[PDB]
Amino acid sequence: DNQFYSVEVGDSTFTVLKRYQNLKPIGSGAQGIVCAAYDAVLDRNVAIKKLSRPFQNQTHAKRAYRELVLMKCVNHKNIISLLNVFTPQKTLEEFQDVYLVMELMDANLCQVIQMELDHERMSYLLYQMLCGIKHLHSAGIIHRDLKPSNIVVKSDCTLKILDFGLARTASFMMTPYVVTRYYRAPEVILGMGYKENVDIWSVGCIMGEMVRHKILFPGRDYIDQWNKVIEQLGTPCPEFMKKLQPTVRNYVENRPKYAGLTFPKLFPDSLFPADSEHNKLKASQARDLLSKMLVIDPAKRISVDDALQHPYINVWYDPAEVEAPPPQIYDKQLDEREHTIEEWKELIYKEVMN
Ligand SMILES: Nc1ncnc2c1ncn2[C@@H]1O[C@H](COP(=O)(O)O)[C@@H](O)[C@H]1O
C-alpha cells in the first residue's frame, strides 16, 4: 500500500494522492509547475501546484507559509480556494514538498489580454477583480503585486485572484526567474508608504493593457519603468514630489520632464468597441475609469469603493459579492515574522498537517 504515486512532468516528479489522475501541465511560475488533474473522489477536475522545498530560503518560505494560512482562512468567490493540501513525506525530517490542490480554471489573464473583449465581459472581469481586492482589504491584506499571470478566468467569464501579494514587511534569490514589476504602483516603485488604493494602480495597468493589448509601462528595471510612466502620464505635479524622501525626491525632480499625453490620445476610440451608441457610451465610461485609476499620486487616485460605484462597473454591483464577512486570520503575526530555514520547515509542516 501507498496512498501516493509518482509521475514525471517536465524536469519534475509529481508524487500525488491516487485520487488525482491524468496530470497535464497547465502553467509555470516562480514556485514551479502547475498541473491539471481529474480528482476521482470529487469527480471533477482540479489544479495541483507543487512547492519544492519551500523552506529552502526566507523568500519562498515566507510566501509559502503566508499563502497556506491565507488560502485556508479566506472564503470569497473571486479569490482562489484550496481544495486540498498534502505532502507525500511521512515525517518532519523527511519533509520536502507541499502540494496545493485548487479548483481548476481555464486560463490566466495574459491569455484574455491577447483577445478583444466586449464591454460586458471587460467590465465584469474588472468588477470581479475589485470584489476580490475589496475582500482582501477588508481582512487587512493589501496585495501590491497584482498581475495578469496571477489572475485566472473560466470560459464563463468568472475570475479568481491566485495569490495574496507582498507582506507589509520587507528578498535575494539565486535564480533564472525574473520578477515582473510592470504593474507595481509609483508608491511601491519609490517606496513611499501606501494605502488600499495602491492596488487600483495595478488594475488600471491591467485594464489599460486589456484595451491596448500591450504592457503599459514596460521597463528593464524601475528607472525605465518610471520613465515609461511619466512619458505617458506626464511628470507628476509638485504636491506629489513633496511627499517623497529627499533622496528619491531629488531623483524624480531631475528626470527629463514630460507634460504627458491625454487619455483620448493614450487610449483612442479605435481600441474600443464603438459601433453602436451603447458601445460609444461604454467606451467613454471606460476611458473615464482608466483616467481615475492610472493617477500617479495616490491621494487623487480613485479608491476601491468609488471604482465599484463607477458607471462602467456598477451594473454588476451586488452587496453579497461586495461587503462580505472578512476572514478571521487566526495568526496575526503573519505578514512580518523572521525565521531560519529549519524553523520555517517546521512552521510549514505544522500547517500542512494542521
Ligand atoms: N488554479 C489554477 N487554475 C488554472 N490555472 C492555474 C491555476 N493556478 C495556476 N495556474 C496557471 O499556472 C500559472 C502560474 O501559476 P502561479 O505560479 O501559481 O501563478 C498561472 O499563470 C496559470 O496559468
Side-chain angles (χ1 to χ4, degrees):
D1 192 318
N2 192 11
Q3 289 180 323
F4 303 85
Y5 74 106
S6 275
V7 72
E8 225 63 17
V9 308
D11 312 335
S12 264
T13 297
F14 276 57
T15 294
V16 303
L17 292 162
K18 275 163 171 175
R19 64 189 290 178
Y20 305 119
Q21 299 294 302
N22 197 36
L23 275 69
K24 309 210 303 304
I26 52 172
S28 193
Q31 49 264 31
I33 301 271
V34 186
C35 279
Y38 174 68
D39 173 5
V41 171
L42 291 177
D43 182 32
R44 54 180 270 200
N45 288 341
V46 295
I48 299 161
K49 189 185 202 191
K50 179 191 188 181
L51 311 183
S52 308
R53 302 192 66 80
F55 47 80
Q56 72 181 266
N57 62 56
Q58 195 96 224
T59 309
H60 283 317
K62 197 191 256 67
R63 178 154 77 251
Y65 173 77
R66 183 151 180 281
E67 302 259 322
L68 270 169
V69 169
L70 293 176
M71 268 205 204
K72 291 180 181 198
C73 77
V74 169
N75 188 31
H76 194 279
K77 69 197 215 183
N78 302 120
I79 299 159
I80 201 72
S81 50
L82 199 60
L83 296 180
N84 202 12
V85 193
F86 67 84
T87 174
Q89 289 89 36
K90 316 307 190 171
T91 65
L92 172 52
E93 34 277 341
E94 288 163 287
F95 174 52
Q96 298 216 73
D97 305 328
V98 179
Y99 289 84
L100 306 163
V101 189
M102 304 156 275
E103 63 208 299
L104 180 63
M105 302 291 287
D106 303 317
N108 68 50
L109 247 209
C110 312
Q111 306 170 253
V112 171
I113 278 167
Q114 295 305 299
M115 54 182 63
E116 302 186 347
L117 298 153
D118 59 287
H119 287 288
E120 276 44 54
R121 285 178 172 84
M122 181 161 313
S123 75
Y124 183 52
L125 288 179
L126 296 159
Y127 170 71
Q128 284 177 102
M129 289 169 73
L130 292 170
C131 287
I133 291 161
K134 173 56 175 301
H135 192 62
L136 292 180
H137 291 172
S138 73
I141 300 163
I142 299 166
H143 197 290
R144 307 195 272 106
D145 200 39
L146 290 175
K147 63 194 78 177
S149 63
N150 307 154
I151 296 169
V152 283
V153 302
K154 280 223 304 315
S155 260
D156 67 357
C157 212
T158 52
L159 175 147
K160 290 174 200 277
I161 298 169
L162 287 186
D163 60 1
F164 303 79
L166 314 174
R168 45 193 193 187
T169 192
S171 61
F172 171 76
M173 288 199 312
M174 310 228 319
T175 180
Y177 200 90
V178 196
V179 76
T180 308
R181 291 167 296 268
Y182 311 143
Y183 308 87
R184 306 215 181 174
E187 58 258 46
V188 171
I189 291 178
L190 303 169
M192 69 184 69
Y194 61 80
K195 55 169 170 178
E196 277 73 350
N197 76 348
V198 72
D199 287 327
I200 288 298
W201 172 273
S202 305
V203 176
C205 294
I206 290 160
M207 173 180 190
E209 181 170 359
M210 277 165 81
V211 168
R212 198 185 275 175
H213 315 290
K214 294 183 185 181
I215 297 150
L216 293 196
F217 312 125
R220 299 167 298 181
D221 76 302
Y222 281 161
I223 296 291
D224 266 73
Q225 192 163 320
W226 180 251
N227 289 344
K228 279 304 210 311
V229 168
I230 53 171
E231 88 186 32
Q232 296 188 48
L233 279 53
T235 305
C237 80
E239 55 166 12
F240 170 76
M241 303 288 209
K242 188 173 192 215
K243 301 194 290 182
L244 275 39
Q245 288 294 135
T247 181
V248 54
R249 146 63 170 281
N250 157 250
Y251 164 72
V252 183
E253 249 70 338
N254 288 258
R255 279 267 148 265
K257 192 163 178 170
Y258 320 78
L261 282 70
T262 202
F263 283 90
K265 294 156 70 180
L266 286 167
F267 308 95
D269 289 289
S270 49
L271 302 174
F272 300 92
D275 47 343
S276 61
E277 293 286 350
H278 182 264
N279 284 349
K280 288 185 200 303
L281 182 52
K282 288 290 172 204
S284 160
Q285 291 172 348
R287 189 186 292 104
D288 194 67
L289 181 60
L290 268 171
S291 75
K292 292 174 178 162
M293 290 196 306
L294 294 167
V295 182
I296 296 179
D297 180 3
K300 300 182 293 81
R301 187 191 301 143
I302 196 169
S303 73
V304 174
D305 300 316
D306 292 346
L308 280 157
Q309 292 300 106
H310 189 99
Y312 194 67
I313 301 303
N314 73 34
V315 299
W316 305 107
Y317 193 101
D318 180 334
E321 306 167 313
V322 198
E323 311 164 54
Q328 273 292 83
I329 308 189
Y330 26 82
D331 184 337
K332 299 139 167 152
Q333 194 149 316
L334 185 46
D335 286 35
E336 200 272 278
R337 62 213 256 73
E338 265 237 33
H339 296 288
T340 53
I341 56 187
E342 185 162 30
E343 290 169 342
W344 276 125
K345 186 167 153 167
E346 177 158 1
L347 266 318
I348 293 172
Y349 194 65
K350 286 181 180 200
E351 196 65 23
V352 169
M353 263 30 186
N354 294 305

